[PDB]
Amino acid sequence: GRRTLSQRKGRGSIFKSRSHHKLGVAQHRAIDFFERHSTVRGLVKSIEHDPGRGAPLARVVFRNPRQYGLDKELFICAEGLYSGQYIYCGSKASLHIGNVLPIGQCPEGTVVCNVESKPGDRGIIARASGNYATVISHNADNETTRIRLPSGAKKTLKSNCRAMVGIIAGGGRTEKPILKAGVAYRMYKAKRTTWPRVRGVAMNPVDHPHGGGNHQHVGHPTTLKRSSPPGQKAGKVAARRTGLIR
Amino acid sequence: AVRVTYVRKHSYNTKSNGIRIVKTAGGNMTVQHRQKISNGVRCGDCGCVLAGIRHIRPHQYGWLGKSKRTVTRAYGGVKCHKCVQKKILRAFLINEHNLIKLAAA
Amino acid sequence: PKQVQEFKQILKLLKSGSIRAVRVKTNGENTKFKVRCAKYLYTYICADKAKAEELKKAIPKDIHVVEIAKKAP
Amino acid sequence: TGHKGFSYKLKLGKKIHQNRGVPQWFRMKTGNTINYNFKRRHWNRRKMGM
Amino acid sequence: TKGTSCRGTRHNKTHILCKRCGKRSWHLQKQRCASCGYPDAKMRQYAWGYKALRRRTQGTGRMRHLKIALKR
Amino acid sequence: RTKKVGIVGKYGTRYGASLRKVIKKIEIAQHSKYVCPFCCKEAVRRTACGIWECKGCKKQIAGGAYTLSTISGATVRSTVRRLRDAKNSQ
RNA sequence: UUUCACUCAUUUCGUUAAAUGUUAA
RNA sequence: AAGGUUCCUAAACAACAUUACUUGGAUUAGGGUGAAUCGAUCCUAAAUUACAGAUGGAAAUCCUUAAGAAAAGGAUUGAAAGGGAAUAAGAUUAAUAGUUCUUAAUCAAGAGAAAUGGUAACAUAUCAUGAACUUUAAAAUGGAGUGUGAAAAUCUACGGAAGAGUUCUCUUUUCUUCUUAACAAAAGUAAAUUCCACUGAAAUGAAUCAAUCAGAGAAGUGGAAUUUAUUGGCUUUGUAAGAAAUUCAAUGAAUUGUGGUAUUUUUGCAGUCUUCAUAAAAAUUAAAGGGAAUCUUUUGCUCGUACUAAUAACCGCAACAGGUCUCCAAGAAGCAAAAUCUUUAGUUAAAUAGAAUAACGCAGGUAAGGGAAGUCGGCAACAUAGCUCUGUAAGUUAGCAAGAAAGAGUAGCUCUGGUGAUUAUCGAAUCAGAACUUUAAAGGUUAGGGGAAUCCGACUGUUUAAUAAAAACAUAGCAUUCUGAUAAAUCUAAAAGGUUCAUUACAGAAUGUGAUUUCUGCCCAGUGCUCUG
RNA sequence: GAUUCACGCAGUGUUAACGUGCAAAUUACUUGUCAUAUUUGAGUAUAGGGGCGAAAGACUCAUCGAACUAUCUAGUAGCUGG
């Protein structure tokens, strides 16, 4: 047989990210003394639309604390931020929407976004539009805090992980039903080349494991092991359940 | 109804390939290479087009008179008159407010 | 090609040392004094015949003068 | 094309130079078998692949 | 339309003349010569191409500076 | 001019009655003006998904994809204020 | 062998390797 | 782009262009391609390749700033359609011309305690000092549709000059020319937008085709700025009439007003709509914050430049009815860049002709009476067809069906009235109405056959280049599975290797069904998958 | 991602012409379509148990249910011809 389309995707030839008009990398500024033992003030110059993502990006301009000049960052807009706003980042920042504080200073029940999964990595969790993470508890013995991930899973992180207070803007993006195939075509203008998906059963046995015979069907169970080799791994992987839920 | 031809070797109607057809002696129509439309300066704060500066190409400002590319004012040529008035009030009022708040208030 | 507007500069222009050649053209109604200098070709239009003569008394004798009329030279 | 590199034009010119025939005096040498130039081509007959 | 009609759009060169072998074998997009093995320092020769070896090799040219050395 | 297909009357008769009714709520709220939280003028209009600009006020506000403020984005702003006030005092 | 504590190879990251740790203040 | 001397001239016609050739894109021999201003050269985009390093048995692969004692900061290449300093008119050659000649310019690199004015928006033939460092702006950014300024083309009113056509029947008639560059100047005078000063709006006003705006301030008056194909948009001026065009004479003479409430094209401007789409970067330039320090003339190098750009110069074996990216664009008529005819330009030859006018053919037609009785099948042909008024069913996702179906009118000549601007004249095609006449009028060309049902696919869309265009594929909708990112999928022999990922569960990856409505029944024995056992 | 006409494009029908053709897939009328899931030039990326595919085993230089080219190779033939 041939190589299935999933195999061809890892090569990255026509499936590369269409990132040409993208604004940049959206993350917190590098952690330093002024972000660890003081506060820095940032001015939200503008709010812009980053292609390929559902949330607006804000151009924040911090003054350089060690040298003379500016220091331009690119934050992700928390819902409610406006142009000309002042945002403060540091271990002593005020607990307002848009400020950046270590996850160990927020009280229990605080809603944060753009959480660092490891201190100094500048943003991993809760980054999609309308998403957020909640603070569950603190453990001052080992300086670790528990937060609830947007998927519902619970994670343990060090209290030094910075985070931005609030929820990510652009909420309710996926609630609008796509109506036309053209609208779905324009969704991936800054994404991968994956939209028009041909059913495996509609192909031939060479191309796909589902390539059927005189009747369009699968013929073998579509729940497979995780250890299945690439090429034959299709459908559901390590599925503990199937069907509809009542 | 005199029909003309491209004078240069460009054969496509790109932005840099703008042409205007003018008349000449004997009813002759020639081809003139017309320039592109350029934007003006904007205030660095509000993004509004400043008044008193022409909208020409960046190299053409070198040929302009030294007094014909800027406005005689503080932060003139980079900020609007409104962009500067708020700067003066911010620089003054904030300085006065903290002059009475700390240092043995 | 530039154009001078009155007498006070053309006499000043002629009395300067930057002149190169002068062509005087007698049109149907007016007369043009196209003084060719190093850079430009300054011209002056006169409707008075007498005022034109005063210019011709001021032309330096060490320069070339060309007469142009209804027939090309 | 109208536009060409300097080296390409000189190799174009040499192809013009080599599209000639045997001079008459050369054909009159003793024991001569060279009467025609079999390396000849015409623009509408064969493209020179360059 | 895979025959006569599809040949009309062929006006873009794939190979141009190479600098080391002089043949129209320099691939413009691949940036290598199919014949003499350009920028690769070693000349491109293969045992399966025995005829390709007897067309361009030592002794097929002028031998400007080696004819005297072996004669000497 | 219409009876019940107000703004989704441009879709004609080719997307399903339910799907046109669902998108009616979004399409009305997407193209509607909102009260500016600073100058209190009904001038805020959408520019991109999640970005709103006050036309006669010179401000840009981050918000929901189709509404200026979402329900989930409003209870969060009140929740933070309550925690902030409690944290400051004892 | 198992169960713990450390770092010292090692894994994964961040920067203009730009105030880490301990004292004085 | 591709071709490569096919371009021009002369001699010559053995061969070639399915006859012939004095012709030739064919033979022979000469000649022809001129740039400071047009491009390459310069910059970067997708992407591409080096030293050192990492990997590999190996060739070699990876990395492109991360690993480096390498590069104030990040190497090489990458566009004759992206960005970009500066040239136009006339004439000339058998052929080159934004390239030569005349005339007229432009640009770059050189050389010879530091200003006023306006309340303000802001303004001053260089002017009126401004280093390191930092910032801002420009280069530099989608599409649609509406309104409008300006130029050109076409059309038209007024006043002529010159030439040509018609003229036995008339025609104060019909036709042609009446022009102007780059670069600069500033008599006169526009449209639109944004700001500034006075004053403070409600009895709310102001405004557009639509909108839209106002006490963080409307309308009014008076100013300022920018754009409008070079200076400053239009007329005008220098250029510049000496050019060029139309005439006259045998080189020499004549003239070259003013408009339009018309159409199209181009070009800007102003707001409106639209996106789960937001629609490049660098070279290079200017300004600001800051306060360190105390007109003339010279040069402007390398390369391309001829010709076709196609029913004969390109790709298809060819002078092949196939294919191949663009620029400029007249009149009639009409809704129309439609069909049809003509003007400027091009051509009359583009695989040979003459005679006769048999059958069978290819292309275009017509037909007595009947009207699908032919045939697998109304296949092929016939038939309806523009515009205006009336009128329009079941069904329905309430949007449609719908140009449903059906009926009436339409010509020519002579008139009448409506739709405006300026204080009677001026101008636009459009609508309606009335007599009279005839061959009773959309139909020269262009130009929907209609209705009642059944099956499949929901729809717009894609598909077996060369026998299958479809009920097949896609699609939005529904649903399922895994993954906290050192992950999931997955390329590589390996790799501080690679893709989704400039990403982070409203996400990534893997699948089935196929809009909307209604409903998704019972079974965990077997085979898969899973388990915290 | 409404209905149509036009410049263009495709290839529904005649299963017309042609079928030692204009053409190793073309011509005429008819039909469909004729801007947003649009058409298109150049640059660039993806390569053979590989690529690309709105999926026909389609396309990958007139070559595809595994391209072209050279070597193993004068591959083997209980089969056919001499």
Swiss-Prot record, chain A:
- Would you kindly state one Gene Ontology biological process term found in this protein's UniProt entry? cytoplasmic translation
- Gene Ontology cellular-component terms listed: cytosolic large ribosomal subunit
This protein's UniProt keywords = Cytoplasm, Ribonucleoprotein, Ribosomal protein
**Which stretches are annotated as coiled coil?**
none
The UniProt annotation puts the region (Disordered) at 206-246
Q: Please, which domain of life does this record's source organism belong to? A: Eukaryota
User: Which compartments does it reside in?
Assistant: Cytoplasm
Q: Which SUPFAM superfamilies match?
A: Nucleic acid-binding proteins, Translation proteins SH3-like domain
Gene Ontology MF annotations? RNA binding; structural constituent of ribosome
Question: What protein family does this chain belong to?
Answer: Belongs to the universal ribosomal protein uL2 family.
Give the record's subunit note.
Component of the large ribosomal subunit.
Q: What does this protein do?
A: Component of the large ribosomal subunit. The ribosome is a large ribonucleoprotein complex responsible for the synthesis of proteins in the cell.
Name of the molecule in the record: Large ribosomal subunit protein uL2
Which species expresses this protein natively? Entamoeba histolytica (strain ATCC 30459 / HM-1:IMSS / ABRM)
